[PDB]
Every structure is written in C-alpha cells, then in structure tokens.
C-alpha cells in the first residue's frame, strides 16, 4: 500500500491534473478571502475534479471540451487512466498516512441513471449510484448517508426544502484523511497548547489556544507575494506550508491571486531555506468541513450552464434527457496525530514566531499538490 500510483501511459496528464488541483485550491482561497473574510474554513479540490471528470465521460462535445479545459485533461483515455490512479491514491491507508475519498451520485426514484453512467462511474471511481425519493426526506437521506458512511457528524450544506421533484443530479463525496507526524529525532511536531493573543482580520482582539510546535523545517520571507512562509515535513513525502502576511494589514489578496497559477506553489517550495522552527499555531488538530462546491464554481465563472434546469449538454448521464447538476457535496474530516503528555515535557515552549493574526495552510502530498487548503481569519 502506497500513494504513488501513476498511470504509466498518461503520466504527463496525471502531472497536469495535479496542476489543475493546485490551481483550484488557489482559486478557492482567493475567493474565500474575497467573499467570506469572516469565515475560517478549509477544503479539498480532489472531489470536485473527480466529479467533473466523471461528467466528462458522459457529455456532448462542447461540454466535454469545457470540462477538459478545467481538468487539464484532453481525452477519454486520460480521464479514465489518470483518475483510476489518483482515486487509488486517495483511498489508500498505510503507516505514512490514511486517505479515503468515496463518491455517490443521487437521482430521483423515477429518473434512473443510464447504464452507461453507472458503469463508467463504477469503473473509473468505484462510484455508486443511489435512487431516492426526491419528494420524501431526501435531504435527511443524504445527510444520514454522508454522516454514517464517513463517521463525520458535521452538518451538511443542504437544508430541508432544498430537494424536490424538479431537483436534478446530486453528486456527493466524503474525504477522510489522517496524518501522523514524522518520526525522526527532529521531526516537527506539536507539543503543548499555550495561550496567545490573536488579532482577527476585522481587528477583533481575543485570546486563543495555540499548539507550541517545534522541529526541523524551512522558512522564507517572500516579498513579491507579501507573505512569510513556514514549511515542514510530516512523514517523508508530505509537506505542510503555513503562510501569513508580512504586513500587519493582512494584505493577502496578491498571494492568493498568484496561487491560482500552479507555478506559485512550486516557486514557494524552492524559496524556503532550512531553519529549525519553534512556532505557536492556533489550529485544531481535527478539522471538519461540509460544503456544496457549486456556489464556488459559479463564483469562478466556470461551467455555469451545467447548473441550469434547462441544461442540455450531457449525453449519457441519462438515456432519456441531458439532466443538470443541482448539488455537488463534499464532506471532509482532516485529522493530525495528537501529541502525548510525555512529548510535552520534552520541550520548553518558547516560540520564535506566533501566528497571532490571519494565516493559511496547505497540506501537500508527494506530488507537491494540496490535499487541503485552509484559511484562518478569526
Ligand atoms: Na530552498
């Protein structure tokens, strides 16, 4: 069991797909800071890519082309083979880290999916379809499934009333990832929680608990992006990046806009230089998120026709009609290993840097693409 599965025939395309993932994470945080500066939040883009990939196997020509442009993939062979590899990775558990990413497609009991869709969803993703009554307790059916299957009880993005007989295709994903810390003598780890003073984006002053953490890492002040960045490994292959503004004014928008370009993260990862890190970070080691991607995809100006009731661009999702996409749910639990009382006693909590204002994080795998991106503003 490992997380380096790659298609050997479409290798370049898999690397390009990771660049699409990296860039979507950038669009995501750029939009969060613009539209939702009051929110602390995090997310993963892999389930969105998987959903769009699935749709790209079942679309008419123009829609297929638009889907391909967003995926950085350009053929059925690429979509199938890249996604089979990445799906395997994101469903592997081993001693290095554990990942689960499971997909469902919902439709009303009287509108069954095409056998073509059911087959390709199973083939590429081990996706499963569910036929439910859109007139009776459909929100609860979905909520209960996501929460039960994932073990994650956070509330879902739907509210009762959101689903009726005119509702179209509903796609869902749940992602559960667990990361242990490195096991080297100087692996960066959290040790103990300490009080810090925090100043929120809107100026609110408060006290927070923060994990005093230390170990080998990397650091840079990156003037052109207006940020300082701290970087450390988990188990080998995995990297966390923490960033925060150079200025007290939290001028983060230029950094987030640049993160829309996948080159920016590759640049960041080389600008940093080795530094022993002693930090205090106000973050929870278990984080949960549940969202509907569609509002964010619409904010980005992408694929807007797919979400209209009159859409006619799908070919083989249904035998009798196009169908349209109503909700794209992503239900996420991110967990980091908890430190022990014995570990706490081994260090003196004297941080060189405290994250005492808005900051962001990315967690990367061995392909240097983010499994998750998060933003803390308050
Ligand atoms: Na470097």
Residue numbers in the entry: 15 to 392
Mind quoting what the paper says about this structure?
Serpins play important roles in multiple processes, such as blood coagulation, fibrinolysis, tumor metastasis and immunity. Mature serpins usually contain 350–400 amino acids and share a conserved folding pattern that is mainly composed of eight or nine α-helices, three β-sheets, and a reactive center loop (RCL). The exposed RCL is located near the carboxyl-terminus, and it acts as bait for protease binding and cleavage. Three homologous serpins have been identified in the silk gland (a highly specialized organ that functions to synthesize and store silk proteins) of Bombyx mori: serpin16, serpin18, and serpin22.
To understand the physiological roles and inhibitory mechanism of these serpins, we determined the crystal structure of serpin18 at 1.65 Å. The overall fold of serpin18 resembles the canonical serpin conformation: an α/β fold consisting of one core β-sheets surrounded by nine α-helices (hA–hI) that are classified according to the conventional serpin nomenclature. Specifically, the segment with residues Glu352–Pro368 makes up the active RCL region, which is folded into a 1.5-turn helix (Glu355–Ser360) and two defined loops (Gln352–Thr354 and Gln361–Pro365, respectively). All residues of the RCL were well defined in the final electron density map, presumably because of the interaction between the RCL region and the underlying protein scaffold. The RCL in serpin18 is situated directly above of β-sheet C, and is closer to the core of the protein compared to those of the classical serpins. Further structural analysis showed that the RCL in serpin18 adopts a more stable conformation, presumably because of interactions between the RCL center region and β-sheet C. Furthermore, multiple-sequence alignment and structural analyses showed that the RCL in serpin18 is shorter by about 7 amino acids compared to that of the typical serpins. Notably, the length of the RCL up to the scissile bond in serpin18 is only 11 amino acids, whereas the length in other serpins is always 17 residues (P17–P1)23. Moreover, the papain-like mammalian cysteine protease, cathepsin L, was also inactivated by serpin18. These results demonstrated that serpin18 might act as a cysteine protease inhibitor, instead of as a serine protease inhibitor. In contrast, the inhibitory activities of the V362G and V362T mutants dramatically decreased, resulting in an extrapolated molar ratio of inhibitor-to-protease, which increased from ~1.3 for the wild-type to ~5–7 for the Val362 variants. This result confirmed the importance of Val362 at the reactive site of serpin18. Thus, we conclude that serpin18 plays a physiological role in regulating the activity of fibroinase and protecting silk proteins from degradation during B. mori development.
